[PDB]
RNA sequence: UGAGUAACGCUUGGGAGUGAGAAUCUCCCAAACCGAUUGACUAAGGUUUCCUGGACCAGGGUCGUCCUUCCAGGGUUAGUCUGGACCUAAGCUGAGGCUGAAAAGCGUAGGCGAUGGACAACAGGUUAAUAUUCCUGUACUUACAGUUAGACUGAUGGAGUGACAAAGAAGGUUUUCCACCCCCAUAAUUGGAUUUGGGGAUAAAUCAUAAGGUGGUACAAUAGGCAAAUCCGUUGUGCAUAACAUUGAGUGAUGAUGUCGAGUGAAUGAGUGAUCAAGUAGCGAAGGUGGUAUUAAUCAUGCUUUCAAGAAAAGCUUCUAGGGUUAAUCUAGCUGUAACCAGUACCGAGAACGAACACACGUAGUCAAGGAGAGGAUCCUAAGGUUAGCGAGUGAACUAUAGCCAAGGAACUCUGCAAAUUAACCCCGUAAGUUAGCGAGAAGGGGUGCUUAUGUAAAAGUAAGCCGCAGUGAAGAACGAGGGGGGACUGUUUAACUAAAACACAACUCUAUGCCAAACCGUAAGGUGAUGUAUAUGGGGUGACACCUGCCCAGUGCUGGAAGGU
RNA sequence: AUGAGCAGGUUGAAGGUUGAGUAACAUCAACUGGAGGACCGAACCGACUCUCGUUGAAACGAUAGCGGAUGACUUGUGAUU
């Protein structure tokens, strides 16, 4: 069997958790595949704990994660991070995230997950 | 005369050799008059059924035919001017653009020796024995060179016509007509005394000394592969089949039409020339 | 001359959209075998106001109620677009 | 690839329409038979 | 039954909305591929598949509120575009006529037949769907009538032009491009910012000027051009560094107080709001200077060389014939009238065409961006376009595609099959053999990055310094040597198992053929050979080049032969 | 029969001009010239090899290599056997 489709390759799979973050940091919910929640927690967690100095070297490593979205640019979910979301994560051990599932899709029965920054 | 080309083009070696057409012909470009111009129609080998009769021809390149005078008798007692010798692609002996004193044109074979300047005068009485004078056959000296013989009386010039061609007069006959005339293959023939002629030799004698070089120079001037019979099939052709390279088998050579061909003659004897002909190459009549 | 290559007027967007503005645009349905003199002639014979020019439409029959039970052809059609000059309108309906 | 049947609007005509059919007794022969068997498509000149 | 099994035929995430129901529909933001193309214009073909609204019987390899599916309505505007009313090529038809049991075949005059020739329109705007067609602006062409002025008008016929090959290289002018300048927006909290990004346009037509290109110019005689000629052709004379005739890309002025234009940007109304409305209407600045040792287009149907010697007719000009003379016709100007018929939608193809399929196949031409690059190669993107019409998981065996593999390096196997090495540019060097052309990119080696300075029109290069394990740091680039068999070579061949030593090829030889030629298609007419003429044509065999080709005429074949026998 | 197409880059023949040379030829050197069934290599044409597929995406293809690529070339339209 040949000309198969490029596959979850892992730069598709590092895009894909780079877009659901950016969401995910923009709106405040993403309703997604509960595989696919499970993986963008660990980069959200990550990209928040290491957004708490906000240094000019902090904000060079998140702008290697973030993306453009609807509501924010790229620059202005910068600002967005550093000064609402991240400091009200100031002195929580970790956590910040939680994944709940929802029910299963009508044309596929895969297990759907809302992502939301507890608060 | 001949000149070589050097292709130095490293796919094979090929010695071609192609006449020069720079010290022969007066202008080296292509220059036709256009009143004597008709365009040839290419029929490739295939007869009014559209079905391939002559095989091995088709592919030539486009020509146009040059009006050639072969008759020459219009313009009797008229002198005419030579006034360029000219490369003719319908037929291997150069042609010349001649003029008469009216100012009427015409294209003649160019008889071998003249060159631009040269006086031509035809009629029916002596005239003089200058090369491309064309009288009838009754008052020229036996021994002289002449080309296009004229075989029917009023007619135009037929034998004699290729690059290099002549033909010898070898006396009269005691009928009072019939002349004779001595032709190339070693053919002697009686040519009735009103037929009328032209003395010369036909230009371009190194025709026979061109090599061509290449098989696409032969495809180009009209000539098809020709598949020899011995790979053929046992079908389309008497000497087909085998296994392997295998001789004639049969008795002798035949065609592909399936007759002997080989030493057999096949000329029909009862015809009206056979009593003009003294000789056929081999021995009487 | 007989005037029964004057078929039917017909009413489109496209028709009111030019039938506005100074010169108006009256758009017929005539003879398929009528050329554009014989369309200026019977407008001069049945309204009375010369065309300042005419064009024409073909508009090629297709397949109609396709699956329907039974399937039919359209018509042929030949449109023509009459403008009358600067400043005069007059009505399709009314003499 | 290149297969057998290259639509041609003018070659179709030509080849098997009705005035090709209409030139030779074959031709004529032929038609006489479709009106036998009574063809809605008499020739292909009748494409619509 | 196999069996709810194989398969579902190259492309992701999220937010908002509609809806009874949404991974699949709409909008938005990204993301990933195409970008000598999945981009744009059309020929052929397809024949309404095009636009709007609605629907989800059936079709869509899943779903569906959605569709190239179905229903209803609508959509294709020409004196100048593509073809007829114009002309012919191959070829077809073909009154008479020829040939033939019949049907019919051939064929003259005529008539058709583009893939060619001749012919007058460009720029912008507008609708959901058409636009050199509709609208605005500015033009041009052909007919008819009246009129003014001038002139003798001159074809169904003659002549000239139309009218032409392949390859190659120089010029002239515009360009591409480079530099400067003008105008618009921008001044940036992540360390430093004194900048960053974008635009700089106008056609057909009229008038004037045209770099140049092409070819000698007038006068006089003429017997030749189915009659005639003042035209053509021919022959003389004079002048011929030029004149004369024809053609000619570009330039300037009107066309243009116009249009387009980067950007700026509403109102009105829908809606709960945002948003739509729309980034729409409207507004809309600059709209230039110089160079070029870089570019492509035109002049150009120009020029040179070579042999394989490179369409016809219409049309245009001209000539008399023929018609006028108290006229007709033509030319130039003005006024007015008219300009017919068919096509014009959309697709033009990993979904509209030919392949039965929304099939990994195939289909003429035209426009061709930037960086590096010889390049239309290669990598990434621009204008633009798509979301490969089943998804979500897991990362067992096993399969396909890739990547890598320590030591050995063909030990594997029928065989180094396959895979691997080399690969671009520049600088050195290059053998045996040879038909002296080649072999040859032979073999074998070296350098490539960045900075400074010197070099140039730009370079290339040169000198010094710096970094890394590695510097055409990624993509795209030949593995080589030696001996032998066959075919000289370039080529052609069994569409869909055999591309080869087979076929062909230039060359050699034999044979037939004197022209109403031999040979060949048919029954014959007719035709090919050939509008050719033994330096030519047909057939058999061998297959560059070099050296050779021996003996046998008993049998067979072929040619000739006196008589004699049957 | 009538049209169209072959990005780009190399090798540098015949011939001609000049000079030396020859009693005059021959020959040699420089310059010009741009030929080749020439060379490398895209579009284009073809199909030599491995693998996959063999109830296929496909009643003959896909990926990776491969041969020709100014000519005995490729191709569109029309006619014809
Ligand atoms: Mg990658
Ligand atoms: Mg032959
Ligand atoms: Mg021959
Ligand atoms: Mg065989
Ligand atoms: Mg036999
Ligand atoms: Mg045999
Ligand atoms: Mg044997
Ligand atoms: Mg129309
Ligand atoms: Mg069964
Ligand atoms: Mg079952
Ligand atoms: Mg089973
Ligand atoms: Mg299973
Ligand atoms: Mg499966
Ligand atoms: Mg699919
Ligand atoms: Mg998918
Ligand atoms: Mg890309
Ligand atoms: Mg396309
Ligand atoms: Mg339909
Ligand atoms: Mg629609
Ligand atoms: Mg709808
Ligand atoms: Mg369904
Ligand atoms: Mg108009
Ligand atoms: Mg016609
Ligand atoms: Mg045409
Ligand atoms: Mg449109
Ligand atoms: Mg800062
Ligand atoms: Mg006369
Ligand atoms: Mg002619
Ligand atoms: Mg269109
Ligand atoms: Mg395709
Ligand atoms: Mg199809
Ligand atoms: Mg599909
Ligand atoms: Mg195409
Ligand atoms: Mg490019
Ligand atoms: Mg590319
Ligand atoms: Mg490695
Ligand atoms: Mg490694
Ligand atoms: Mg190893
Ligand atoms: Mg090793
Ligand atoms: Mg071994
Ligand atoms: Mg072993
Ligand atoms: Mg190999
Ligand atoms: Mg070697
Ligand atoms: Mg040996
Ligand atoms: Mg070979
Ligand atoms: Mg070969
Ligand atoms: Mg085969
Ligand atoms: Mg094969
Ligand atoms: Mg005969
Ligand atoms: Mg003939
Ligand atoms: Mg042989
Ligand atoms: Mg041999
Ligand atoms: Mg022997
Ligand atoms: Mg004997
Ligand atoms: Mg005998
Ligand atoms: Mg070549």
């Not at chain 1, 400091?87 to 997950?113: H, I, W």
């Not at chain 3, 028709?15 to 398929?32: A, D, I, L, S, W």
């Not at chain 4, 080849?15 to 030139?23: I, P």
């Amino acid at each position: 069997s040949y000309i198969n489709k490029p596959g979850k390759t892992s730069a598709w799979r590092v895009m894909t958790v780079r877009q659901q973050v950016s969401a995910v940091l923009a709106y405040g919910k993403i309703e997604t595949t509960l595989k696919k929640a499970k993986n963008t927690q660990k980069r959200l967690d990550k990209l928040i704990t290491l957004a708490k100095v906000d240094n000019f070297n902090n904000r060079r490593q998140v702008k290697k994660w973030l993306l453009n979205t609807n509501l924010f640019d790229v620059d202005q979910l910068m600002d967005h991070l550093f000064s609402k979301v991240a400091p009200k994560y100031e002195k929580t051990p970790g956590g910040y995230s939680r994944v709940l599932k929802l029910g299963p899709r009508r044309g596929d029965a895969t297990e759907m997950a809302i992502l939301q920054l507890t608060d | 005369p001949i000149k070589k080309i050097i292709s130095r083009s490293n796919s094979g070696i090929h010695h071609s050799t192609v006449i020069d057409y720079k010290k022969l012909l007066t202008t080296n470009k292509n220059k036709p008059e256009k009143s004597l111009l008709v365009t040839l129609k290419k029929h490739g080998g295939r007869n009014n059924q559209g079905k391939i009769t002559v095989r091995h021809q088709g592919g030539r390149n486009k020509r146009k035919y040059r009006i050639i005078d072969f008759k020459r008798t219009h313009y009797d007692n008229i002198e005419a001017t030579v006034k360029s010798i000219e490369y003719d692609p319908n037929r291997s002996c150069f042609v010349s653009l001649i003029t008469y004193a009216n100012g009427a044109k015409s294209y003649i074979i160019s008889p071998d020796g003249i060159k631009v300047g040269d006086k031509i005068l035809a009629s029916e009485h002596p005239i003089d024995i200058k090369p491309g004078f064309s009288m009838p056959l009754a008052f020229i000296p036996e021994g002289t060179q002449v080309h296009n013989i004229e075989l029917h009386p009023k007619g135009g010039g037929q034998i004699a016509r290729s690059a290099g061609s002549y033909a010898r007069i070898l006396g009269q006959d005691e009928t009072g007509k019939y002349v004779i005339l001595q032709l190339l293959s070693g053919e002697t023939r009686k040519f009735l005394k009103e037929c009328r002629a032209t003395v010369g030799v036909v230009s371009n004698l190194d025709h026979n000394l061109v090599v061509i070089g290449k098989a696409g120079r032969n495809r180009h001037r009209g000539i098809r592969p020709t598949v020899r019979g011995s790979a053929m099939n046992p079908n389309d052709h008497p000497h087909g089949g085998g296994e392997g390279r295998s001789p004639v088998g049969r008795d002798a050579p035949r065609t592909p039409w399936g007759k002997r061909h080989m030493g057999v003659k096949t000329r029909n004897m009862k015809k009206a020339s056979t009593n003009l002909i003294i000789r056929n190459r081999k021995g009487e009549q | 001359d007989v005037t029964n290559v004057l078929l039917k007027p017909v009413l489109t967007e496209k028709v009111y959209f030019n039938q506005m503005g100074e010169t108006k645009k009256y758009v017929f349905v005539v003879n398929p075998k009528a050329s554009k003199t014989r369309v200026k002639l019977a407008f001069e014979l049945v309204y009375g106001i010369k065309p300042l020019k005419v064009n024409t439409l073909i508009r090629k029959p297709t397949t109609i109620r396709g699956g329907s039970r039974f399937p039919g052809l359209s018509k042929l059609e030949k449109l023509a677009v009459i403008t009358l000059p600067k400043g005069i309108a007059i009505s399709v309906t009314g003499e | 690839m290149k297969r057998t049947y290259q639509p041609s609007k003018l070659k179709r005509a030509k080849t098997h329409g009705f005035l090709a059919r209409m030139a030779t007794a074959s031709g004529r022969k032929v038609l006489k038979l479709r009106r036998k068997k009574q063809r809605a498509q008499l020739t292909v000149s009748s494409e619509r």
